[PDB]
């Protein structure tokens, strides 16, 4: 008891400092950054806000609970106040409440007091200049609080932050003028709590009412604030719309646009994983392997944790349907390994041309196939076994009888033996010629050609268009 | 001061991988445990091998008496430093504590290595230290510390010059290149052959002869192979003593394929029971397939398999499934025809592969620059 | 003469066809003799396309240019974290 009682005081001072000065220096600094320059944006405290939010998402967040200075909620949410020279007095009132909190119990517990608190900024009337400061002062307690998952009486409080964000959405439909430089930070912050829309709604069932609401927000941002807005909202669309049918494959067709410019960073890569599974549902394997590889290869630096391992998991799925895959056991991480353990023997069965080896993988690992969600291609891969199996043996064997190859091709009658190779040439597999009497399959090859034209002529536009973009970057980054 | 414990580490490999030896491996382990008075090594061996019955007071009084031999040295260091001399004090405590660390783990070892690092003015004692990191790295199969001691020693050795100990290091780096997969550097650094003679750090000289003659058949060219074994004057006798590998050498040049898999069976059986050769045999075998079949097909562009089947015993339908299944694995790709009786080789791949490295390397090259291009800025 | 029969070229060298085929093919094994024989009709043909030089230049550039972007991995991924 004395140890646990005296170890309570040490923890709070760290949130009492960094959690106090995180939105004070970044938010209060963004106030001066929003008064002028305001180029672009930039508003570098918006990306610094991303660093602080992602910092809280690990440790320590804020709420909890935690029974440490719950008076931080009324601190920033009250006392604009009101015009800038009067706000300076309230800038001293934060220090006044620092002394009040340094004297008495400092209101270490709020809970049901969030009802007057969250409505106090509406009692001030008003900030009135910066809506992102009002939305952030209310959300910063509540957004990390969603990670508690208590599911009692505070879920509707998260919904109240969603209503405050809807007031941020109506103000996202009006001003401007003309030229809002704070709406990019509103795109950032709202995309977060739009994913908190996803989490809080997913506590019970699908959000479908918010699918028409997201389409209302996604379309009302057109065309003005779509920049960096439409990208995050399209992932908010694509993610759960990939979980719930339907039509998103043809919906993103008419939705594009592209939509440029890609922001922010890994956002477009993860979008190419989301739409990567989409474009993989059309089964064209050149665009699917390029969108899946570009999804993972374009994402630094992690941690955390396993969904960046999931894009790598589903990445080589289209490579399994290509007919040739390397053994990936050397790419296993300490985490991704234990997650894909069935998928290991799966791609090992894809390398081999044995049917029973692949079918036993299906019967045993079908439970993990339910966990991943990819099924339909597991039964049709038997056609990849007959095409890779015939690619194997044909190129392999000098002249193979249709009765001897019939074991690995499982039928290979005297009739279909013609089509196996012939319709493989239709798919561009093997050139083997067969004169059918008994018969026997005599595989030869003569090709000397290509390896030339498209690679070098495309490399011209590749390199040139690249260095042109690198011009568009460097030439435009010299403002300082 | 190595081979006794080197055999213990070899006995660890004899216990670890094969599960079918329950008698001789533990017997001679105890025969080597009752000597050198090992403590920490028999703890790891106690968990892997049998737990007895009882050790307890036996090796605890042996570690108590060795502690008296440990405490007579560790209480002599303050009595020796009472006087003053050059290395006549600390050279006793650096080598004997490494013998006291030979009793267990890395502790006295690493702490004496950096201890004496600031004292010895001669490279011979520094290389003896290097020998201690190499033996303790060989027992625990740790390749991290065997690179650093040699990298620091060679600068002092190559400043520089040596005869014997330079050939010793060539055997070391040859054992490290063969510990991981390096085919060329193992035989190239073992080209010294008999000039190393026999040493306690080189263990059995016949085993070293088998190490260089087993690794010289892969990455070395066929004219260079017979130039090493046949033209080599000193290496020819020591490889002649064992007919197992010598039969594989002269029959590989004789091109006869009827003795190959039997001679390779004896070679592979020796490859299985030797340490550090376990990961490398899987590629080593199929490499000997494409090695012997490279001179099989190169005889004639269009070859009649009837002439192949003349003396095989029997190669009529065997080379069909044999070579084919080796073609399907990627070893010696060729297009062969039957009932036309034409084995056609080729395949030169002088067009695709000639220009393929451009687009191939350029794929991942331009990919890796596409990452860094589209990541920044934003 | 590139294309030649094996029996009358063994008459010029004055040797049996068995060790003429195996020695000449052994010369192809040494790469000093450019060509190949034909056992079916008893023919020996010489052909060559020596220059690899452009592939050497290509490979030397791009294979090292791998490590080039690896070197740029240090700087351009340092600004991130």
């Amino acid at each position: 008891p004395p140890g646990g009682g005296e170890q309570e005081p040490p923890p709070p001072p760290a949130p009492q400092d960094v959690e106090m000065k995180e939105e004070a220096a970044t938010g209060g600094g963004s106030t001066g950054e929003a008064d002028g320059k305001t180029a672009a944006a930039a508003a570098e405290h918006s990306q610094r806000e991303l660093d602080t939010v992602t910092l809280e998402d690990i440790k320590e967040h804020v709420k909890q609970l935690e029974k440490a200075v719950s008076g931080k909620e009324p601190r920033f949410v009250l006392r604009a106040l009101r015009m800038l020279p009067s706000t300076s007095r309230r800038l001293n009132h934060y220090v006044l409440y620092k002394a009040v909190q340094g004297f008495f119990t400092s209101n270490n517990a709020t809970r049901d007091f969030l009802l007057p608190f969250l409505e106090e900024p509406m009692d001030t009337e008003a900030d009135l200049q910066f809506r992102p400061r009002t939305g952030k002062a209310a959300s910063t307690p509540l957004l990390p609080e969603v990670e508690a998952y208590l599911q009692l009486l505070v879920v509707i409080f998260m919904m109240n932050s969603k209503r405050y964000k809807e007031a941020q959405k109506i103000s996202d439909d009006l001003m401007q003028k003309i030229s809002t430089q704070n709406r990019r930070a509103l795109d950032l912050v709202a995309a977060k709590c739009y994913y908190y829309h996803a989490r809080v709604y997913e506590f019970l069932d699908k959000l479908d009412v918010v699918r028409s609401f997201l389409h209302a927000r996604l379309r009302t941002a057109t065309l003005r604030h779509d920049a960096d807005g439409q990208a995050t909202l399209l992932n908010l669309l694509l993610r759960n719309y990939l979980h719930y049918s339907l039509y998103d494959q043809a919906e993103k067709l008419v939705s594009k646009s592209v939509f440029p410019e890609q922001a922010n960073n890994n956002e477009w890569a993860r979008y190419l994983y989301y739409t990567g599974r989409i474009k993989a549902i059309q089964l064209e394997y050149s665009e699917a392997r390029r969108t899946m590889t570009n999804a993972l290869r374009k994402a630094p630096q992690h941690t955390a944790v396993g969904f960046k391992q999931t894009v790598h998991k589903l990445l080589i799925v289209v490579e399994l349907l290509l007919g040739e895959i390397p053994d990936r056991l050397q790419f296993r991480q300490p985490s991704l390994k234990r997650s894909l353990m069935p998928y290991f023997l799966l791609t090992q069965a894809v390398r081999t041309g044995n049917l029973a080896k692949f079918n036993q993988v299906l019967d045993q690992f079908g439970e993990k196939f339910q966990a991943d969600g990819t099924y339909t291609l597991i039964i049709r891969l038997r056609h990849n076994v007959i095409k890779t199996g015939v690619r194997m043996i044909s190129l392999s064997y000098s002249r193979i009888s249709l009765a001897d190859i019939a074991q690995k091709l499982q039928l290979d009658s005297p009739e279909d033996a013609e089509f196996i190779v012939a319709k493989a040439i239709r798919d561009g597999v093997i050139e083997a010629s067969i004169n059918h009497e008994k018969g026997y399959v005599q595989s030869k090859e003569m090709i000397d050609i290509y390896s030339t034209r498209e690679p070098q002529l495309a490399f011209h536009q590749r390199i040139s268009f690249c260095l042109d973009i690198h011009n568009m970057s460097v030439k435009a980054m010299r403002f300082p | 001061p190595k081979n006794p414990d080197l055999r213990i580490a070899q006995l660890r490999f004899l216990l670890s991988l094969p599960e079918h030896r329950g008698d001789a491996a533990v017997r001679d382990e105890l025969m080597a445990a009752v000597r050198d008075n090992n403590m920490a090594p028999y703890y790891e061996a106690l968990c892997k091998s049998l737990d007895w019955q009882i050790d307890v007071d036996l090796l605890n009084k042996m570690k108590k008496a060795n502690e008296d031999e440990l405490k007579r040295l560790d209480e002599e260091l303050e009595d020796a430093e009472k006087n003053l001399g050059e290395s006549e004090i600390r050279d006793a405590m650096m080598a004997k504590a490494e013998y006291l660390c030979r009793i267990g783990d890395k502790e006295g070892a690493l702490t004496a290595f950096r201890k004496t690092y600031d004292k010895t003015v001669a490279l011979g004692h520094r290389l003896d230290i290097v020998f201690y990191l190499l033996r303790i790295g060989l027992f625990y199969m740790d390749n991290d510390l065997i690179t650093r001691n040699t990298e620091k020693a060679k600068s002092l050795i190559e400043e520089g010059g040596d005869w014997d100990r330079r050939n010793r290091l060539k055997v070391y780096q040859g054992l490290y290149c063969v510990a991981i997969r390096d085919f060329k550097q193992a035989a190239e650094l073992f080209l010294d052959t008999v000039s190393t003679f026999t040493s306690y750090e080189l263990m059995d000289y016949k085993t070293f002869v088998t190490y260089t003659v087993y690794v010289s058949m892969i990455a070395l060219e066929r004219p260079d192979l017979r130039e090493k074994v046949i033209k080599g004057a000193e290496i020819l006798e020591v490889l002649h003593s064992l007919p197992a590998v010598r039969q594989y050498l002269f029959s590989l040049y004789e091109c006869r394929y009827s003795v190959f898999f039997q001679s390779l069976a004896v070679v592979e059986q020796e490859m299985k029971k030797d340490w550090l050769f376990a990961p490398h045999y899987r590629y080593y075998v199929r490499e000997m397939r494409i090695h012997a079949y490279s001179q099989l097909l190169e005889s004639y562009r269009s070859l009649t398999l009837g002439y192949m089947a003349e003396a095989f015993g029997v190669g009529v339908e065997f080379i069909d499934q044999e070579l084919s299944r080796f073609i399907a694995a990627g070893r010696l790709h060729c297009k062969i025809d039957k009932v036309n009786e034409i084995v056609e080789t080729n395949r030169p791949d002088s067009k695709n592969w000639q220009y393929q490295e451009t687009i191939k390397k350029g794929d991942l090259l331009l990919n890796r620059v596409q990452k860094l291009s589209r990541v920044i800025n934003m | 003469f590139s294309r030649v029969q094996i029996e009358h070229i063994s008459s010029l060298i004055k040797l049996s066809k068995a060790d003429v085929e195996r020695k000449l093919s052994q010369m192809i094994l040494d790469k000093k003799f450019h060509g190949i024989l034909d056992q079916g009709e008893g023919v020996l043909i010489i052909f060559d396309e020596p220059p690899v030089d452009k592939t050497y230049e290509a490979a030397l550039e791009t294979i090292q240019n791998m490590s080039k972007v690896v070197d740029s991995l240090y700087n351009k991924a340092k600004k991130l974290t």
Binding site: I463, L467, R478, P480 | S373 | -
Partner: peptide, 30 residues
Amino acid sequence: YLASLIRSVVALHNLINNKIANRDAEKKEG
């Protein structure tokens, strides 16, 4: 073929070095 080789060399040098001196000038001044 040589043209594509100069493309890779020119793009490698110029793009890497320019982005280096670019990102450095921005992060140091800003």
